[PDB]
């Protein structure tokens, strides 16, 4: 859920060389002391707690091993990634669809789509330096990034098909009857109809 | 149209001249730099006479 | 076998260290024989100063020296000799050596430098002449530059009426700027000479710039308004009668 | 802690807190030193002749205060420290010359698209979308410099996102204007209402 | 094989203050059913171990190595080596580099379906080349500049750059052919027979 | 470490060591004379003037003194008038034009009886600018030259904005290179910085004027009507100072 | 157009086949079943070598 992720981070503390039968450790409080805690610009500590644990391995019946684990639940403050990562991706995603309102005769459809893709590729630098380079799972930033990339590429492919269709003439192709029926007869009936048949 | 075609043919001829000139200049410069790099070898002796 | 701090040691240090560290990484132990012979083999991680000859980078070879000498004792107190038992070379155990993936060792001699001309001191210098293995730069820099150069050539076969000469030439220039950004992370920063890779990159940039300029000239000739512009007679003679025969351009009819 | 809101035109309040690591306020206490005249030096001292200002930061103020606390009955032994507050101002010239001015000019370039012809060779969309690409390059540049906290958004980032949104809107507008300009009677029918609005009413209202 | 690579790291332990003459190194011995066995692997607590975010441990052997050629009083005679064979988990590189790079490279084949009258063929091809250059810039920061091999992603990027350059050259040739006129070129009957009748029939063109 | 030593400190230490930390051996003569030649890495704070960068000269200094001893109990004297550069390794970025050490003695009003001594060694250095000339200045010069070519490119090519905007894009991408290479300070504007800003404004002005030229070229005869001032200035008067055929 | 169609049917299979080859070398790259080539032992806690 990065950048809206929640992280549970522990700190396991114990006497390295003394077992419970010679040195016993107990917590001073149920919670860590956060009275002198400096505010963080990236994380909010929702919950914090300390738990004592005792373990006895079968080979060692009489020497319990003690530890105190202090766990912290932390929520990332997502504003930086929203402003610097998500909003540009959203703008590119919006710009992707605008090619389909551009006339073919403008000679700028490929310019627009390819420039959107070039912007997204340059943005890959920002994302990879800011995103975590781990393979435990795909972040939401990564999923949205790949989504935008894939659909810009899809827009480019379909735009090439549209331009190819637009430039067809009787000296190169003959119009199939099903194309006439589907696109020139049925579909425009359920559309704006401001366009003349 | 005839005058326009004369100007266009002049442009084509100049383009072909520049094509050949660029091929020659590119090949010569690239070959010079690449041969300068290739024939830079480590010294045969640790302590060459200078 | 005795802890090194328990015996007298010669204060042999790397004089030409670059980080301020003169000494060995771990003192370990000396081996003392019954005749008083002491052998000491301490490990050391050393960062030494090597003046880089940048002229032929990345097809370069370097001459990185490690100068070892006593920091305090003079030649009248401690005399140095190249260690041997007479191989005056850096020893490299063939099986256990960690070969570097970017450098091949060509030569590895050692020499005793006598004092120039007490306070005078000998030195033992271990030289490493190393050749770079440039495959990374061939794949990542040189080959793309060659491809961009080929595209710059092929701009002159693109017809003027396509309206695409400028786009091709100038995007080739933009791609070369991206490769300049690539090289900025890697090249040396000294100013005694220019690396040959930088020379090749600037050569390619100048070529693409001239391709842009000459494409503009060709487009200016192609789109020249017939009424506002009158062909001068020398232009007719040279470019329509003389040059086409030499360039094997047969104007139809 | 860097207050990012007005970066690079920002000022910061960096504290230097000094205290005994061992002794409490009953064991060791602090007072400020006095100058030759006996005036208490309740500030950071700076030798003017030997001082060289930081290349990016000017020290505007530097008061000092001796604080005493935790003297309550429950708290037990009192504690004390000395806090100096360096109020420092950034000198923003680098960001003005290298980032803000070029970004402002390049983002102003999209307004020129409204003056290019709405034909096949006008390159209206060339100007707009490539300005967006240049702004993406500037986003990559600015990401290397800005602080990486989320308490607020820095001025530099806010301006860049604002001009990116404006460029996106102008791209949409250029697409719309091209779509309207290139309509042919063999595809579209002459909408009389919009024609009345744009050709007859708007010039009169203008 | 990067990013589908596996590595073979090692941790070699020995004594520099003592030799095989003075200490003998051996592997730890554990017991089961009153039968002793050597511990010939790196121990990993199954419950406490958190796996690395990019590396999976496949094998983790341990070995005592004795060099028969070295003298017994050399420090290099004996050692114990703990090896880690680790496989990279390539999900990150896949999602963020390889799928976009492959898709962008494969888009260059679309120029063959664009008409020459669109006026945007070479721009598409050269822009794909630019995007590949950006990807090469990205990869160059992530691997060492060794010469033992070209990385797999490097091989693909070089192959794609060469193919895109070839496609740009082909687009130039196609445009040159398209824009020929009687005033500039002669269309021979052989070329017409080959390209307008024979090849379109073979290729099942419309 | 066994003997009394003077506690020399680099007064203008920036973020390194204030005093000697490498305690090498002292040579002691039978007459009591001690020589002690420790090494150090000095990180000295120095006012850096970037006005003429990449062709800048930097007069830097190293102030040395006994931190806790004043001149009345410990006196320091220079061995020589100049720093010893006999074992100086050549630099690939700087050339030491001048170097000199000066002793100074200062008496404060509150302390009329304890003069405070120091020895300040200064080095006047010139930067070697070839690296910045080749890597930074030459690409900017090429972009500036390409800027003017748009005014020789005909409008009917439909490529004017392609050339101009792509030059702008190349310069913007190059700005990443410049920010990586040049230092980032706000004490003053470097010469590279001034040239970089000049080139950028040059390109932006070219784009604006190119848009004006394109708009003039495409002015429809129906909607627009030629002002008499344009006709007199451009069709009637100016071409006489040039050589092209009138309308 | 005919040249464009021939180039579509020649270049695209070359691209697909080359990409498939280059990536299939890596997809089927795996560490060997045993840690040491020539040694059949697995060095796993399951396969203890009792003395
Ligand atoms: C740069 O950075 C420095 C350091 O952060 C800034 O200085 C600090 O500014 C704070 C205000 O923003 C100051 O806090 C206020 O102090 C007022 C002083 O009045 C005294 O209050 C005493 C009360 O007990 C104090 O000490 C105990 C110690 O245990 C502590 O728990 C209390 O919270 C309190 O600090 C009293 O004993 C004494 O006689 C004075 O009357 C105080 O009145 C303020 O309280 C108001 O605001 C708080 C807001 O939370 C509110 O709860 C209260 O009811 C009340 O309305 C503040 O506590 C702080 O003391 C400054 N520190 C110094 C000077 O050392 C500096 O301003 C910054 N500079 C800028 C931004 O330019
Ligand atoms: C780079 O920057 C460094 C500084 O960091 C520059 O170094 C300066 O070089 C000049 C010479 O070019 C130095 O001036 C000389 O100083 C000596 C020694 O002065 C000391 O000793 C004196 C007693 O012998 C003493 O009187 C001096 O004290 C004076 O100043 C203090 C205040 O600072 C004042 O309170 C006193 O009352 C005095 O007025 C000081 O302790 C001095 O002997 C030289 O005199 C000869 O030359 C001068 C030339 O003007 C001439 O006037 C004299 O008559 C005499 O012939 C001279 O003054 C200066 O001190 C150095 N500053 C340092 C090191 O801090 C360096 O030049 C810069 N390089 C470049 C090229 O820019
Ligand atoms: C982030 O990660 C940490 C671990 O790092 C998690 O911490 C765990 O917290 C739980 C409690 O929430 C710990 O479980 C135990 O809590 C018991 C408290 O008693 C309550 O619960 C029982 C059972 O429902 C009720 O009967 C009772 O009335 C209370 O409501 C303790 O009694 C447990 O102690 C037992 O085990 C220890 C260990 O051997 C023995 O020493 C004790 O004698 C006793 O037998 C226990 O402490 C759990 O152990 C914690 N784990 C660790 C490792 O600290 C956080 O919850 C997690 N945060 C998230 C994800 O929100
Ligand atoms: C890598 O770098 C090392 C140094 O870091 C280079 O080593 C230097 O190599 C040069 C050339 O081989 C050496 O120069 C030669 O030194 C000889 C010995 O000089 C010593 O003995 C004389 C006589 O007592 C003393 O006067 C002198 O101070 C030295 O103590 C000289 O005999 C040579 O002179 C001959 O050649 C010169 C050529 O110019 C003639 O002018 C002379 O008349 C004479 O015929 C010569 O000067 C130099 O000493 C080496 N430095 C060392 C060892 O520290 C490596 O060459 C370099 N490797 C590579 C391949 O780049
Ligand atoms: C990850 O990396 C480690 C190294 O860091 C690899 O470990 C090496 O594995 C190889 C193959 O198992 C080892 O090579 C073999 O060594 C055997 C023992 O050699 C010692 O003993 C002989 C006498 O018996 C001495 O002569 C020799 O000097 C040594 O002291 C040999 O018996 C093996 O011979 C076999 O291979 C050769 C190949 O030429 C054949 O000719 C033989 O007939 C025979 O089949 C072999 O040489 C090597 O020693 C290991 N290095 C170590 C332990 O440091 C891992 O295999 C690697 N993991 C991977 C890649 O998955
Ligand atoms: C932020 C920093 C960077 C700024 C970047 C540069 C500044 C960018 C911002 C704005 C200024 C850009 C001006 C470019 C003019 C081009 C020439 C032109 O078309 O003239 C026009 C006059 O235009 C006017 O009517 C006057 C406009 C002045 C606006 C000044 C705002 C500042 C001609 O008008 P027309 O013939 O009726 O045009 C018909 C065709 N059309 C509908 C397509 C227009
Ligand atoms: C037809 C379409 C166009 C074709 C496209 C082919 C694209 C490359 C395909 C992959 C080649 C891999 C290769 O074996 O490269 C070799 C040539 O290495 C070179 O030197 C080649 C690069 C030369 C760059 C230009 C030099 C100009 C002078 C070097 O290989 P290696 O580094 O010894 O080992 C590589 C890794 N391996 C061991 C797994 C093989
Ligand atoms: C048709 C033909 C068109 C040709 C177009 C050619 C264009 C050529 C353009 C050349 C520009 C050269 C700039 C040099 C700056 C020098 C430093 C400076 O004064 O900066 C100051 C801040 O300056 C700012 O804040 C910048 C403001 C914007 C400047 C550019 C506006 C472009 C408008 C476009 C619409 C800092 O003040 P300072 O610290 O007092 O400066 C000391 C300077 N000294 C050391 C030299 C004394
Ligand atoms: C864009 C193109 C036309 C420019 C470069 C063309 C020519 C000059 C290039 C292309 C490939 C080059 C060769 C590639 C590799 C080698 C092997 C090396 O051991 C010596 C140089 C040599 C033999 C090169 C010489 C120059 C060369 C022939
Ligand atoms: C290739 C051409 C057309 C454009 C680029 C020009 C380049 C190659 C020029 C510009 C400045 C030049 C350098 C200027 C001075 C020196 C110092 C000396 O050691 C001679 C060579 C050397 C190092 C030159 C090498 C070539 C150089 C780097
Ligand atoms: C899209 C256009 C209109 C605006 C572009 C600038 C964006 C980044 C600006 C516009 C309004 C801004 C927000 C306004 C107010 C606040 C509350 C403050 O406590 C934290 C920052 C926060 C949440 C700002 C973050 C940045 C912000 C979202
Ligand atoms: C056109 C589509 C397929 C996108 C391009 C996919 C390219 C980049 C290929 C090259 C190598 C491929 C990977 C190789 C191995 C595997 C097998 C399995 O672990 C799941 C898929 C996965 C991880 C593949 C995903 C797709 C992949 C990354
Ligand atoms: C041809 C283009 C898209 C290049 C990328 C090809 C990728 C997507 C393809 C080529 C062959 C594919 C592999 C073929 C077979 C298997 C085995 C099965 O368990 C699924 C995953 C896996 C391992 C595939 C992963 C994806 C793969 C690597
Ligand atoms: O010129 C005299 C002046 O010279 C210098 C010093 O070292 C000072 O002590 C003395 O006052």
Swiss-Prot record, chain C:
Catalytic activity: K(+)(in) = K(+)(out); Na(+)(in) = Na(+)(out)
Superkingdom of this protein's organism: Eukaryota
Organism from which the protein derives: Homo sapiens (Human)
Designated name of the protein: Acetylcholine receptor subunit beta
Glycosylation site list: 63
Residues of the whole record sequence present: 102 to 364 of 501
Main location: membrane
Sequence ranges on the Extracellular membrane side: 1-133
Annotated S-S bridges: 50-64
Membrane topology: Multi-pass membrane protein
Swiss-Prot record, chain D:
Sequence ranges on the Extracellular membrane side: 144-158
Residues glycosylated per entry: 13
Localization in the cell: Postsynaptic cell membrane; Cell membrane
Topological region Cytoplasmic: 117-124
GO aspect biological process, one term: chemical synaptic transmission
Keyword check for Cell membrane: yes
Bilayer-crossing regions: 92-116, 125-143, 159-180
Main subcellular location of this protein, as a coarse class: membrane
One Gene Ontology MF term: acetylcholine receptor activity
Keyword field: Cell membrane, Congenital myasthenic syndrome, Disease variant, Disulfide bond, Glycoprotein, Ion channel, Ion transport, Ligand-gated ion channel, Membrane, Postsynaptic cell membrane, Receptor, Signal, Synapse, Transmembrane, Transmembrane helix, Transport
Effect upon mutating residue 137 to A: In CMS4A; slow-channel mutation; increases gating equilibrium constant by 25-fold, owing to increased opening rate and decreased closing rate; no effect on the choline dissociation rate constant
Homology family: Belongs to the ligand-gated ion channel (TC 1.A.9) family. Acetylcholine receptor (TC 1.A.9.1) subfamily. Epsilon/CHRNE sub-subfamily.
Quaternary structure and partners: Pentamer of two alpha chains, and one each of the beta, delta, and gamma (in immature muscle) or epsilon (in mature muscle) chains. The muscle heteropentamer composed of alpha-1, beta-1, delta, epsilon subunits interacts with the alpha-conotoxin ImII.
Role according to the record: After binding acetylcholine, the AChR responds by an extensive change in conformation that affects all subunits and leads to opening of an ion-conducting channel across the plasma membrane.
Name of the featured protein: Acetylcholine receptor subunit epsilon
Organism for this UniProt entry: Homo sapiens (Human)
Swiss-Prot record, chain E:
Location in or out of the cell: Postsynaptic cell membrane; Cell membrane
Carbohydrate attachment residues: 8
Disease affiliated with this protein: Multiple pterygium syndrome, lethal type: Multiple pterygia are found infrequently in children with arthrogryposis and in fetuses with fetal akinesia syndrome. In lethal multiple pterygium syndrome there is intrauterine growth retardation, multiple pterygia, and flexion contractures causing severe arthrogryposis and fetal akinesia. Subcutaneous edema can be severe, causing fetal hydrops with cystic hygroma and lung hypoplasia. Oligohydramnios and facial anomalies are frequent.
Stated role: After binding acetylcholine, the AChR responds by an extensive change in conformation that affects all subunits and leads to opening of an ion-conducting channel across the plasma membrane.
Effect of residue 134 to A: Increased length of channel opening
Protein family according to the UniProt entry: Belongs to the ligand-gated ion channel (TC 1.A.9) family. Acetylcholine receptor (TC 1.A.9.1) subfamily. Delta/CHRND sub-subfamily.
Transmembrane segments annotated in the record for this chain: 90-114, 122-143, 156-177
Protein name: Acetylcholine receptor subunit delta
Oligomeric and partner information: Pentamer of two alpha chains, and one each of the beta, delta, and gamma (in immature muscle) or epsilon (in mature muscle) chains. The muscle heteropentamer composed of alpha-1, beta-1, delta, epsilon subunits interacts with the alpha-conotoxin ImII.
Organism field: Homo sapiens (Human)
Domain of life: Eukaryota
UniProtKB/Swiss-Prot annotation, chain F:
Keyword Ion transport: yes
Positions annotated with a glycan in the UniProt record: 59
Residue intervals annotated with topology Extracellular: 1-130, 184-194
Single Gene Ontology MF annotation: acetylcholine-gated monoatomic cation-selective channel activity
GO CC field: acetylcholine-gated channel complex; cell surface; neuromuscular junction; neuron projection; plasma membrane; postsynaptic membrane; postsynaptic specialization membrane; synapse
Recorded catalytic activity of this chain's protein: K(+)(in) = K(+)(out); Na(+)(in) = Na(+)(out)
Membrane topology: Multi-pass membrane protein
Principal cellular location given in the protein's record: membrane
Cytoplasmic side: 152-162
Disulfide partners: 46-60, 110-111
Keywords for the protein's UniProt record, in alphabetical order: Cell membrane, Congenital myasthenic syndrome, Disease variant, Disulfide bond, Glycoprotein, Ion channel, Ion transport, Ligand-gated ion channel, Membrane, Postsynaptic cell membrane, Receptor, Signal, Synapse, Transmembrane, Transmembrane helix, Transport
Subcellular location: Postsynaptic cell membrane; Cell membrane
Family: Belongs to the ligand-gated ion channel (TC 1.A.9) family. Acetylcholine receptor (TC 1.A.9.1) subfamily. Alpha-1/CHRNA1 sub-subfamily.
Protein name, per record: Acetylcholine receptor subunit alpha
Lineage: Eukaryota, Metazoa, Chordata, Craniata, Vertebrata
From-to range in the entire protein, with total length: 103 to 349 of 457
